């Protein structure tokens, strides 16, 4: 979940 | 009498439940970057795809053949769906939409081949068939329409005394191809590949007829 | 039907010249029997004990021995317009394959372009030279083109009219 | 026993890879 969050935040 | 069957079903149910939770939770992580491609624009997918392969690469470092095959088959199905929709709504629009879709397929295959290279570095049957049929049925029509539009600048100089019924010949050549029962965008027929090589001979016939006309009025 | 042929010749001439040089391995104008085996190896096909000797024998008809670029165009043109000539075509096929090659493993759909140029023919006639189908593609090599062409020519040659003739009924 | 050992090793490797990935993502976010 943390990795997915970080991913989405970086993409945003 | 039924308790052997119930312990067997209990073991099957626990194993299936555990693998289902892991599979669902990992396939759910994919969703927030796969969501744009169901209804958005054809060029957006080019920028979205790197996020999709970053996601897929991090999640296939954990849990295999069914994931690759099913995921990739449906994502490429969705790419075909979006391209086919974005073409279906003349000349510049058609050439632009075919260029965009071919570029999408090209960047998809290129970045997946880079992804496989990396996956080999640290420690595609559906793509082949479907995008190969798509790219051939797009290449044929993009080259046909580019040639037609390159010959289409002649189409309004109707006052020269030797360009009257020749353009009606070119119109018939276009029309007989564009009255045929098969759908042009579908690679499910693949019989227009003889119609294109009959069109390609009377295009050169038109070329040489116009060359003789130029040679003949001097 | 002339326009297809004239236009095809107009473009294939430049391809043919390089095809010739590429078949040559000694950087000369002469194509020795030695080179032919090397070419087949590139295609991925193997000759028989006497195939090469027949291949060199039949093509050359203005001198004896090795072949020359002049013989090669003479062969090309005669074979191309050969259709109802019942003439040899042993070395025409290997060169036409090399010229019609641009993938360096063989060619797939381009057979149809070859076919239409020879004649409009039919989809069933295509199912004769090979088993290619309109929707499906295949992988192909040197092995599967030469053998099938050679066999087809032997199959046409055999049929002739003795008591196979059929007259309108009374 | 072999299956349990394999599961434990896989979990440890996954945790390590996860930490490394999280660090990579954090570095990428900082750079952006």
TrEMBL record, chain C:
Gene3D superfamilies in alphabetical order: EF-hand (1.10.238.10)
PROSITE patterns, alphabetized: EF_HAND_1, EF_HAND_2
InterPro entries linked to this entry: Centrin_CML-like, EF-hand-dom_pair, EF_Hand_1_Ca_BS, EF_hand_dom
Gene Ontology molecular-function annotations: calcium ion binding
Keyword Transferase found: no
Span of domain EF-hand: 11-46, 47-82
UniProt keyword list: Calcium, Repeat
GO cellular component terms, A-Z: organelle
SMART domains on file: EFh (SM00054)
Protein known as: Outer dynein arm-docking complex protein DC3
Organism from which the protein derives: Chlamydomonas reinhardtii (Chlamydomonas smithii)
From TrEMBL, chain D:
Coiled coil: none
Protein name, as recorded: Uncharacterized protein
């Amino acid at each position: 979940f943390k990795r997915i969050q970080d991913a989405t935040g970086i993409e945003d | 009498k039924a308790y052997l069957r119930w312990r067997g079903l209990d073991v099957q149910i626990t194993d299936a439940a555990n693998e289902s939770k892991d599979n669902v939770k990992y396939l759910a992580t994919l969703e927030k970057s796969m969501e744009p491609m169901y209804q958005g624009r054809v060029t957006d997918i080019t920028e979205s795809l790197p996020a999709l392969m970053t996601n897929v690469r991090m999640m296939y470092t954990i849990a295999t053949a069914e994931h690759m095959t099913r995921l990739f088959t449906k994502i490429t199905n969705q790419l075909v769906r979006r391209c086919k929709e974005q073409i279906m709504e003349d000349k510049v629009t058609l050439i632009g939409n075919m260029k965009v879709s071919v570029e999408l397929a090209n960047v998809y295959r290129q970045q997946y081949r880079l992804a496989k290279e990396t996956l080999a570095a640290q420690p595609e049957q559906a793509i082949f068939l479907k995008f190969d049929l798509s790219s051939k049925a797009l290449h044929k029509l993009i080259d046909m329409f580019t040639t037609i539009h390159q010959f289409s600048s002649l189409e309004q100089h109707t006052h020269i005394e030797g360009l009257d019924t020749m353009l009606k010949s070119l119109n018939n050549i276009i029309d007989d191809v564009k009255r045929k029962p098969y759908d042009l965008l579908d690679y499910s027929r693949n019989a227009f590949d003889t119609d294109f090589l009959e069109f390609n001979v009377q295009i050169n016939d038109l070329e040489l007829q116009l060359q003789g006309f130029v040679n003949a009025s001097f | 039907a002339a326009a297809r042929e004239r236009y095809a010749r107009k473009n294939e001439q430049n391809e043919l010249e390089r095809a010739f040089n590429t078949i040559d391995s000694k950087g000369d104008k002469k194509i020795d029997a030695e080179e032919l085996t090397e070419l087949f190896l590139r295609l991925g096909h193997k000759p028989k004990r006497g195939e090469v000797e027949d291949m060199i024998w039949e093509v050359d008809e203005d001198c004896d021995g090795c072949i020359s670029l002049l013989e090669f165009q003479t062969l090309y043109t005669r074979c191309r317009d050969d259709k109802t000539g019942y003439e040899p075509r042993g070395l025409f096929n290997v060169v036409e394959f090399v010229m019609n090659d641009k993938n360096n493993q063989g060619f797939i759909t381009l057979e149809e372009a070859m076919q239409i140029m020879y004649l409009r023919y039919g989809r069933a006639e295509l199912d004769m030279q090979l088993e290619q189908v309109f929707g499906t593609a295949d992988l192909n090599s040197g092995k599967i083109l030469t053998l099938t062409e050679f066999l087809h020519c032997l199959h046409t040659n055999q049929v002739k009219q003795l008591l196979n003739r059929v007259t309108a009924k009374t | 026993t072999p299956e349990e050992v394999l599961a434990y090793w896989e979990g440890l490797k996954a945790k390590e890879e996860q930490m490394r990935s999280l660090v990579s993502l954090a570095e990428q976010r900082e750079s952006s």
